[PDB]
Amino acid sequence: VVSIPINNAGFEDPFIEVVDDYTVDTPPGWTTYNPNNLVPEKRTTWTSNNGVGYVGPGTQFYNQLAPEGRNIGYIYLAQKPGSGVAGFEQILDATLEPDTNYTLKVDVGNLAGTFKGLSFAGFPGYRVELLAGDTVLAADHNNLFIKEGEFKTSTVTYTSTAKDLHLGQKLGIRLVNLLQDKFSGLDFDNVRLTAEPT
Amino acid sequence: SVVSIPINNAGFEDPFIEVVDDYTVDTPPGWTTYNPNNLVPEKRTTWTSNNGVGYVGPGTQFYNQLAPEGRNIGYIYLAQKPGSGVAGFEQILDATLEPDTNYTLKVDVGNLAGTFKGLSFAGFPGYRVELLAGDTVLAADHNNLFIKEGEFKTSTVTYTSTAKDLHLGQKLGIRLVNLLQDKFSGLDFDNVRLTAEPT
Ligand SMILES: [Ca+2]
Numbered sequence: 507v508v509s510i511p512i513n514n515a516g517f518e519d520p521f522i523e524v525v526d527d528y529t530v531d532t533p534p535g536w537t538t539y540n541p542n543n544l545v546p547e548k549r550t551t552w553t554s555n556n557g558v559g560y561v562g563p564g565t566q567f568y569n570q571l572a573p574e575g576r577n578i579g580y581i582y583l584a585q586k587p588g589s590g591v592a593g594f595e596q597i598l599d600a601t602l603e604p605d606t607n608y609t610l611k612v613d614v615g616n617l618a619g620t621f622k623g624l625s626f627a628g629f630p631g632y633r634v635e636l637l638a639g640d641t642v643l644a645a646d647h648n649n650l651f652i653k654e655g656e657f658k659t660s661t662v663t664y665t666s667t668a669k670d671l672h673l674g675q676k677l678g679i680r681l682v683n684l685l686q687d688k689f690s691g692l693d694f695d696n697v698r699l700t701a702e703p704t
Numbered sequence: 705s706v707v708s709i710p711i712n713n714a715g716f717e718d719p720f721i722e723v724v725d726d727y728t729v730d731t732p733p734g735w736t737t738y739n740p741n742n743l744v745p746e747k748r749t750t751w752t753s754n755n756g757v758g759y760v761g762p763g764t765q766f767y768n769q770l771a772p773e774g775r776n777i778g779y780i781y782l783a784q785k786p787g788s789g790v791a792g793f794e795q796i797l798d799a800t801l802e803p804d805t806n807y808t809l810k811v812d813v814g815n816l817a818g819t820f821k822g823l824s825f826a827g828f829p830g831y832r833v834e835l836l837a838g839d840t841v842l843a844a845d846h847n848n849l850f851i852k853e854g855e856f857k858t859s860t861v862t863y864t865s866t867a868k869d870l871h872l873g874q875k876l877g878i879r880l881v882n883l884l885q886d887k888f889s890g891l892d893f894d895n896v897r898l899t900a901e902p903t
């Protein structure tokens with residue numbers, strides 16, 4: 507079993523000093539997955555946005571600390587349910603190899619609580635994708651039940667054969683807010699990808 | 705407190721097929737053709753993209769086991785090149801999405817094996833199994849299982865509803881999808897089962 511390198515895999519960059527403070531800019535190492543043009547180039551707290559947030563001691567929005575380190579990565583979509591999807595994408599240096607079992611794990615979080623008169627009750631749905639090139643090899647579309655204020659680990663698996671059409675193509679990861687309901691923000695952390703010969 | 709949700713022709717046992725490895729090229733009764741990219745024509749032949757039922761019986765040349773359930777499977781074959789789109793089966797149910805309920809959808813997915821006079825069934829196009837409410841995909845297994853040539857494996861899709869779910873009261877649905885991500889570009893499904901349990 508080999509670990510595949512991912513940049514900023516736990517969204518620990520940038521460092522954030524104040525509990526529950528957050529950025530509204532794409533996390534370093536990641537790009538914004540934006541197929542429905544829901545996230546603008548220039549963001550504020552009020553627009554659809556994504557960024558990192560410090561889930562530290564006494565957090566108002568979770569029953570636990572971050573799955574890993576200080577920070578999580580979050581996506582918030584302001585448009586009404588059904589408007590489309592958005593999230594994070596990262597293309598990796600590793601390529602798809604034959605006769606290899608891939609296992610992608612990501613913790614997914616459901617915010618709880620209240621932020622100045624606003625309820626974070628509800629959850630938009632998530633999808634975790636493993637890519638080769640532009641092809642989604644495997645994905646977990648919203649199978650886990652995630653309680654308010656908790657994180658749960660999503661596992662995505664793909665097994666390549668000797669003749670896979672996508673061999674030699676770059677691996678990628680997408681972490682997607684499905685905007686299927688409100689509150690329509692969610693969190694991700696602790697992205698891990700392993701490869702093991704079959 | 706688990707309850708079975710009824711599904712029409714859930715094991716593709718209609719129509720009856722007499723001869724092992726025979727198959728139909730029309731949508732199976734109880735089902736519709738999921739066709740978001742118009743890959744499957746309304747009038748099919750043995751030469752076109754198609755779907756139907758197939759008898760996976762004793763002495764089958766395409767599998768190392770029999771059908772997961774009964775005699776028959778449901779198949780979807782796409783003639784277009786990888787990347788052209790997806791297609792499959794859809795069935796909208798009478799049942800509706802209820803609050804505080806755990807839904808579990810199980811479907812067996814098969815990978816055909818073998819050859820026939822120059823035709824090769826080596827390879828697999830990828831699968832997705834979807835649980836719907838209305839037009840929304842609540843949960844799906846996009847191709848997570850490894851399925852060996854000539855075998856079936858069970859896919860499990862789960863969704864848990866809350867008390868204020870946006871889609872409460874909408875009709876449940878199932879889609880079984882050929883992803884057309886590689887060739888051979890056919891695959892089989894069988895033994896569709898959906899249960900609901902209060903949380
Ligand atoms: Ca982290």
Ligand SMILES: [Ca+2]
Binds near residue numbers: 616617627628629654
């Ligand atoms: Ca929430």
Ligand SMILES: [Ca+2]
Binds near residue numbers: 776777
């Ligand atoms: Ca059957």
Ligand SMILES: [Ca+2]
Binds near residue numbers: 815826828853888
């Ligand atoms: Ca095959």
